[PDB]
């Protein structure tokens, strides 16, 4: 398809089937980096992402849109034809739904034995009858992986937000697909990847869970965003807003204690000279430290705290609100937030390409396409006649431009 | 170096410089999938991850350990010699710290012009003087990206946990390096990747922020893990634990309203017939729906709720605590949590390899290596004699096995 040549992934042919976040996020990341990415939508109903008023302009940019029933008759024939020249196929569905509907990996590899297939699901491509065919939900994936119980406040768990599991899972699919692609180039043989959302999130929540698995205890939840174990680490309230800080180091602790009214605790058997970290539960003065730190911070503006913490080399940062990002010096210098044109000629604002490739940078070349916008061109390219396409449309197996 | 041949990344030579999570997570992910990955540690002090009692056995498995001062004299020579046969180099540092110490991308490409270089920093390789040279911290990246301000409770922001920003950033680096690797196959030219942690997290926080950027409003924070906008979606407390649910669909809403005592609202102007989703802010009875739902769920055990929600086709799941994972049928069936031997010959439990590659699965072949364990072998492999190595050790430029 027509598009500029750019990025590390120029010339790569990616196709994805799925809606909302996880699957499409995986597929569209390839597009940020130069790939030719075809977004498959059902004929009767478009991707449900489209009901979101603004986000899709970001999450569907740089894409080509195909509307095809890939499971039925001529629509299935066309899909499998497309696979013959596709490098990577990404799909998000309810477990092994593709195989159940007749498109096994075997059938896919009949049409392209080099194909990299990435299956994104809530509970995996195989397992028990109870879980395997269940739908993928971000909150369910966090619930099932032990991620949800470790997020939130001491006595109130909460999911990570927004849709954190969908992004981790989609990103993993991208990563794994690029790894499999390397193997294809070395080897001439394709791959099937079973990305289960709960296994992705299981990995991401292991920092303390590894203690539980290995004779220790699981950590408690944070208290109001404070570190579960170490005093003076995490989220704090200043007079002026919120700050995050890391009270770490001999001098840092000595001088901070003096600031906050706790100089008398230095050189104590509980806080011996050379103390680098205050363990809030192991140290009897843990809670007292938090009391004095809260009180001192509540008295000072973020600008004041930042000035003092800079003298002491205590790492810290103001918690920025959404309205503060665009005008931030780093954001400005790096063009971290930019603008582009939608396909219907409106100005849209949002994050630039990330990350920044030096030699072959990504670019935004296309706004989000409309439902079935590129169907006619795609089907032509893979050998369908004008009549073939008309028949597909009239049968409800394809949709062309609005 | 000695290791089994397996995974999609068999034969690939990866080296990483960094400590703790972000950089090492990026590098080690290659090792999960079959790559030869060399973990660089300093000479006088080891990676600080090693102070963690259990996690490092997971986060450093399948790795080779090199202890070398890569910035000084003969240590720099040995490092740059290693680069000559290295496919990917991942480094996590304070902005352009490598360049400032004389190891620029240009110098790296002088030794290997094909080299893929991934730079992981908090704020980027370039920008302003105030931000560019700051240290990377998970909480700071969340604070600076607008991720922290949207997580937590209505009146209490909280960071995603644990170290969520480090994992996203690390994973992104793996993804981007693999993409750059693909391009090297065509051009024979390497690449430099500028991964700034805040830009990674900016992207992950866009779902609602895209409204703010484009004439709408930023979403509110969740209340006790409940959807910011839609009633009956998100986290709820039952009699004997927590569940997540999605109140979506005509019959689902109708029958749930009846269960909870709100039958009289069905067919009103506020909740017309055929309503599929309750917008909690736009619907005058949104808060009322929550009250009644909270009340009904509080009365019932999770077993009872799931039974009822199965009847009604309302998607839901128990929020599992960490002790409930190992014996779960899906975990059991998929071997999601497995066991392996540490190099001290102890049994270690933790997550299996993810995701599951069908043709070329990853495997655990090695426990976490000790400080400088493979220094001698690595240096011998790149042409150093026993005497060359001994001189490096005496000069404090390298450490060999314990």
Structural contact between residues A108 and A15, judged by C-beta atoms closer than 8 angstroms: no
Residues 6+ apart with CB under 8 A from A178: B175, B178, B179, B181, B182
Residues of chain A found within 8 Å of residue B52, distances taken between Cβ atoms: 207, 210
**Structure's resolution in angstroms:** 1.9
Alpha helix stretches (DSSP H) within A188-320: 197-204, 206-213, 250-260, 286-299, 302-311
Mutate to test the interface with A, among B34, B145, B175 (most CBs of A within 10 A): B175
Q: Which residues contact B310 (CB under 8 A, 6 or more apart)?
A: none
Q: Are the Cβ atoms of A156 and B225 closer than 8 angstroms?
A: yes
Q: Which helix (H) or strand (E) holds A243?
A: strand A241-246
Q: How far is CA B357 from CA A52, A91, A187, A195, B177, in A?
A: 34, 15, 15, 9, 19
CB contact under 8 A, B355 and A59: no
Active site residues of B: 166
Dist. CA A262–CA A273, nearest whole Å: 14
Distance CA A49, CA B362 (A): 34
Listed in sequence order, the residues at least 6 apart from A345 whose beta carbon sits closer than 8 Å to its beta carbon are: none
Nearest of B163, B125, B170, B119 to residue B142 by alpha carbon: B163
Residues B394, B395, B399, B402: is their CA dihedral positive or negative?
Answer: positive
Among A131, A139, A307, A349, the residue to mutate for chain B (most B Cβ within 10 A): A139
Q: Which two tokens stand for residue B262?
A: 């709100």
Cα–Cα distance measured from residue A132 to residue A115, given in angstroms and rounded to the nearest whole number: 24
CB within 8 Å: B178 and A179 = yes
Two tokens, residue B256: 């749930």
Q: Are strands B191-196 and B116-121 parallel, antiparallel or unpaired?
A: parallel
Residues 6 or more apart whose Cβ sits within 8 Å of residue A312: A251, A252, A255, A256
* DSSP reduced 3-state for A311: helix
Helix (H) or strand (E) holding A149: helix A147-150
CA distance B288 to B264: 12
CB contact under 8 A, B357 and A193: yes
CB A36 within 8 A of CB A12: yes
Question: How far apart are alpha carbons A179 and B148 in whole angstroms?
Answer: 31
Binding residues of A: 94, 101
B373 vs B395: CA distance, rounded Å: 18
Distance CA B126, CA B53 (A): 36
Residues of A in contact with B189 (CB under 8 A): 359
DSSP string, A201-222: HHHHTHHHHHHHHTTS-PPPPB
| Structure letter (DSSP) for residue B216 | S
How do A13-17 and B36-41 pair as beta strands?
Answer: unpaired
The gap from C-alpha A400 to its chain's centroid, in whole angstroms, comes to: 31
Q: Give the nearest chain B residue to A178 (CA atoms).
A: B178
- β-partners of residue A234 are A226, A245
Contact B151 A160 (CB under 8 A): yes
DSSP A35: -
Q: Which residues pair with B245 in a beta bridge?
A: B234, B316
Alpha helices in A188-281 (DSSP H): 197-204, 206-213, 250-260
- List helix spans (H) across B160-316: 164-187, 197-204, 206-213, 250-260, 286-299, 302-312
**Nearest to residue B218, comparing CAs of B230, B199, B205?**
B205
Task: Indicate the SS3 state at residue B311.
Answer: helix
- Give the Cβ contact number of residue A226 at 10 Å: 23
Q: Cβ separation of B54 and A210 shorter than 8 Å?
A: yes
Mapped to the 3 state alphabet, what secondary structure does B22-79 carry? HHHHHHHHHHHCCCEEEEEECCCCCCHHHHCCCHHHHHCCCCEEEEECCCCHHHHHHH
The answer to whether B290 touches B230, Cβ cutoff 8 Å, is no
Residue B53 has its nearest CB partner, among A156, A185, A216, at: A216
Query: Do B209 and A331 meet the contact criterion of CB atoms below 8 Å apart?
Result: no
Q: Which helix (H) or strand (E) holds A75?
A: helix A73-83
Q: Which residues of B touch A9 (CB under 8 A)?
A: 179, 182-183
- Contact between B193 and A357 (Cβ < 8 Å): yes
Nearest-by-Cβ selection for A359 from B11, B191, B205: B191
**Domains detected in chain A:** 1-223+327-402 (3.40.50.10540), 224-326 (3.30.1540.10)
For A74-104, letters b (16+ CB in 10 Å) and e give bbbebbbebbeebbbbbbbbebbbbbeeebe
CA-based nearest distance A357→chain B, Å = 5
- CA–chain centroid gap for A42, Å, is 24
Cα–Cα nearest to B121, from B100, B90, B95, B87? B95
Vertex B145: Cα angle to B210 and B138 (nearest 5): 140
**Of the candidates A301, A329, A328, A302, the residue with the CA atom closest to the CA atom of residue A317:** A302
Structure-token match 């056995």, residue found: B57
Q: Which two tokens stand for residue B332?
A: 């059991």
A&B contacts, CB < 8 Å = 428
Contact between B57 and A195 using a beta-carbon 8 Å cutoff: no
Q: What is the CA radius of gyration of chain A?
A: 26
Nearest to A156 among B186, B224, B352 (CB): B224
Task: List the catalytic residue out of A166, A194, A211, A402.
Answer: A166
Write the residue in B200, B246, B355 that is nearest to A354 by C-beta.
Answer: B200
Give the annotated binding-site residues of A for CoA. 94, 101
CB B195 within 8 A of CB B176: yes
């Amino acid at each position: 398809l027509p598009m500029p040549k750019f990025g590390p992934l120029a010339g790569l042919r990616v196709v994805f089937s799925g809606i909302e976040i996880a699957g499409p996020f995986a597929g569209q990341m390839f597009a940020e980096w130069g790939a030719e990415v075809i977004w498959i939508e059902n004929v009767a109903w478009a991707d449900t992402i489209r009901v979101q008023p603004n986000y899709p302009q970001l999450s569907r940019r740089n894409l080509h849109a195909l509307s095809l029933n890939i499971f039925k008759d001529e629509g299935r024939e066309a899909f499998l034809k497309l696979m013959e020249t596709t490098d990577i196929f990404i799909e998000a569905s309810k477990g092994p739904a593709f195989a159940r509907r007749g498109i096994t990996d075997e059938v896919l590899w009949q049409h392209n034995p080099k194909l990299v297939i990435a299956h994104l699901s809530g509970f995996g491509q195989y397992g028990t009858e109870e879980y395997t065919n269940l739908p993928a939900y971000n909150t369910i994936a966090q619930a099932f992986s032990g991620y949800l119980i470790q997020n939130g406040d001491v006595d109130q768990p909460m999911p990570a937000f927004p849709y954190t599991a969908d992004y981790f899972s989609g990103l993993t699919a991208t990563t794994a697909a690029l790894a499999a692609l390397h193997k294809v180039r070395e080897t001439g043989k394709g791959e099937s990847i079973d990305i289960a959302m709960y296994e992705v999130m299981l990995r991401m929540g292991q920092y303390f869970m590894m203690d539980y698995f290995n004779g220790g205890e699981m950590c408690p939840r944070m208290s109001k965003g404070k570190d579960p174990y170490y005093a003076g680490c995490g989220l704090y309230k200043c007079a002026d807003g919120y700050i995050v800080m890391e009270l770490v180091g001999i001098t840092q602790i000595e001088e901070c204690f003096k600031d906050i009214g706790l100089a008398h605790l230095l050189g104590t058997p509980e806080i011996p000279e050379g103390t680098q970290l205050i363990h809030r539960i192991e140290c009897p003065y843990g809670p007292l430290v938090e009391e004095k730190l809260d009180a001192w911070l509540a008295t000072h503006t973020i600008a004041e705290v930042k000035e003092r913490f800079a003298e002491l080399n205590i790492a810290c940062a103001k918690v920025l609100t959404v309205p503060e990002l665009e005008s931030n010096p780093q954001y400005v210098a790096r063009e971290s937030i930019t603008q582009w044109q939608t396909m219907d000629g409106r100005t849209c604002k949002g994050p630039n390409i990330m990350p920044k490739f030096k030699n072959n940078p990504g670019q935004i070349w296309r706004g989000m396409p409309s439902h079935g916008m590129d169907t006619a061109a795609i089907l032509k390219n893979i050998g369908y006649s004008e009549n073939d396409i008309q028949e597909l449309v009239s049968k409800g197996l394809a949709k062309v431009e609005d």
